[PDB]
Paper text:
In the first [name]-48:P68A structure (resolved to 2.50 Å), we found [name] bound to chain A/C ([name]-48:P68A-[name]), as well as two empty active sites (chain B/D, [name]-48:P68A)—thus, one [name] molecule per dimer. In chains A and C of [name]-48:P68A-[name], [name] was found covalently bound to the active-site residue S70 and stabilized by H-bonds involving residues S70, T209, Y211, S212, T213, R214, and R250. Comparing the [name] unbound and bound chains of [name]-48:P68A, several conformational changes were evident. [name] binding forces R214 in the β5-β6 loop to move out of the active site. As a result, R214 would then clash with parts of the Ω-loop (D143 to S165) in the native [name]-48. Indeed, we found residues 149 to 161 (for both chains A and C) in the Ω-loop of [name]-48:P68A to be disordered and thus not visible in the electron density maps. Therefore, P68A seems to impose increased flexibility within [name]-48, and this enables both the β5-β6 loop and Ω-loop to occupy alternative conformations and consequently favors [name] binding. The X-ray structure of [name]-48:P68A with four chains in the asymmetric unit revealed that [name] binding requires higher structural flexibility. In contrast, a strongly shortened β5-β6 loop and the absence of R214, as observed in [name]-163, expand the active-site cavity and allow [name]-163 to hydrolyze [name] more efficiently. This supports the hypothesis that P68A increases the flexibility and changes the plasticity of the substrate binding site in [name]-48, allowing the hydrolysis of bulkier drugs such as [name]. While [name]-48:P68A allows [name] binding by a displacement of the β5-β6 and Ω-loops, we hypothesize that for other cephalosporins, the active site of [name]-48:P68A might still be too narrow and rigid to achieve significant hydrolysis.
Author numbering:
A (entry chain B): 24 to 265
B (entry chain A): 24 to 148, 162 to 265
């Protein structure tokens, strides 16, 4: 069912890095990874938690639609793009943490936890600050656990409205051309060791969907582009994209 | 409300071509075009019709959703990408006429004519102008058409054409050669962080080798107006 392809490691070593890529061929229900053990190692979800946090917020009406504006609170923050108004689309594109902490507080522990148990999401543990548990709280999720969650999202199978799932898959739009469509969220876990980078989503082809989840050691923010670059080297190595 | 910017004509004649491009800045609610007369001329919609058709099919049930598989009837047509199975996403992409022909049969004239008239589409008794395309497209963007929100969302999904960290383009191509003038279309919009530019262009397409120019000339104009890099 799974299959180890350690060749992929050359892409991590080329860039002097370490991590795991996990691929899943929907048509052939076959997974692939350079490291089956690390594929199942659970880390903080960091901003990949913005997928489930969007779904819940939309489904509870915290977010009415992807046009609703969330005004900047006027607190200038190290991340220049955080210091403006945002709707769901730009908030996900630019991982606007404070916008989603506010979603989190309006959701509340109770519903947050109930929903993560409905979603089957990683270790389902929200314990910590309701508005930071995904950065420095209890929640743990592995790459293969990201793929099970995303596959459900992709078939409108989560226990929230079809519309909610449709609007979140829209906000995940990352890349589209005439060979593929990538829908995906980045993560950068940096408050608790180990420092890692996430990239989770999937690539849509004419006649298949390839779901991916990768994470990798991220000591300094200089390697943040490697998250996507190494994934695509794998996808390009496996002929999923040209 | 409509400014003529004849400067754009150079993007047409550098490619030894004649046409119109129509832009609509949505924030400011102002449009701009290289040719005001040609922007209100109605040409054959050709495949740009696949948009209202997709909506009606969806909102009626001919199409359950964008995953449903429309199997090839085994008849080999000259466009190779038609000679296979397709879903809404790939039938819009490849402009698979015989798939859409079938949608329309199952929709049937009566229902089709009633809805086309509810969208106030092309003619009220198909030809439509570049500026009528924009106006239809703006309602689609805001989910203001008289079909379900779901209908409208799935069609915008199926209109996805290009996306990066500078813009998203949702659009549909069109090409007709039965009748003069032979015209290509490209209609849709480009989404920015805090604005959305609708576009509609058409151009004399006297052969076919210049089909890429529908997209190329449109981007040269978006590039000029600083809307995209
Ligand atoms: C879209 O507009 C479709 N156009 C047609 O199918 C053509 N004619 O339709 C008639 C009946 C004439 C009409 O008025 O609608 C047609 C295609 S080629 C030719 N000599 N007549 C599809 N047009 C698109 C497109 O937007 O360009 C096609 C994409 N394509 C083009 C060239 C080669 C392969 C694929 C296919 S048809
Ligand atoms: Cl979050
Ligand atoms: Cl909803
Ligand atoms: Cl989309
Ligand atoms: Cl379909």
């Amino acid at each position: 069912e799974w299959q180890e392809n350690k060749s992929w490691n050359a892409h991590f070593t080329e860039h002097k890095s370490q991590g795991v890529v996990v691929l899943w061929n929907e048509n052939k229900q076959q997974g692939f990874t350079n490291n089956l053990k690390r594929a199942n190692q659970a880390f903080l979800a960091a901003s990949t938690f913005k997928i489930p946090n969007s779904l819940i917020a939309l489904d509870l009406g915290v977010v009415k639609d992807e046009h609703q504006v969330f005004k900047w609170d006027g607190q200038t923050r190290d991340i220049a793009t955080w210091n403006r108004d945002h709707n769901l689309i730009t908030a996900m594109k630019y991982s606007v943490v404070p916008v989603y902490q506010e979603f989190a507080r309006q959701i509340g522990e109770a519903r947050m936890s109930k929903m993560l148990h409905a979603f089957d999401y990683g270790n389902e543990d929200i314990s910590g600050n309701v508005d930071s548990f995904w950065l420095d709280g209890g929640i743990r999720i592995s790459a293969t656990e990201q793929i099970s969650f995303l596959r459900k999202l992709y078939h409108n199978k989560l226990h929230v409205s079809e519309r909610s799932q449709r609007i979140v898959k829209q906000a995940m739009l990352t890349e589209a051309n005439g060979d593929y469509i990538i829908r995906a969220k980045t993560g950068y876990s940096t408050r608790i060791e180990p420092k890692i980078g996430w990239w989770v989503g999937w690539v849509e082809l004419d006649d298949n969907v390839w779901f991916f989840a990768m994470n990798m050691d991220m000591p300094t923010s200089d390697g943040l582009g490697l998250r996507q670059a190494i994934t695509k080297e794998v996808l390009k190595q496996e002929k999923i994209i040209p």
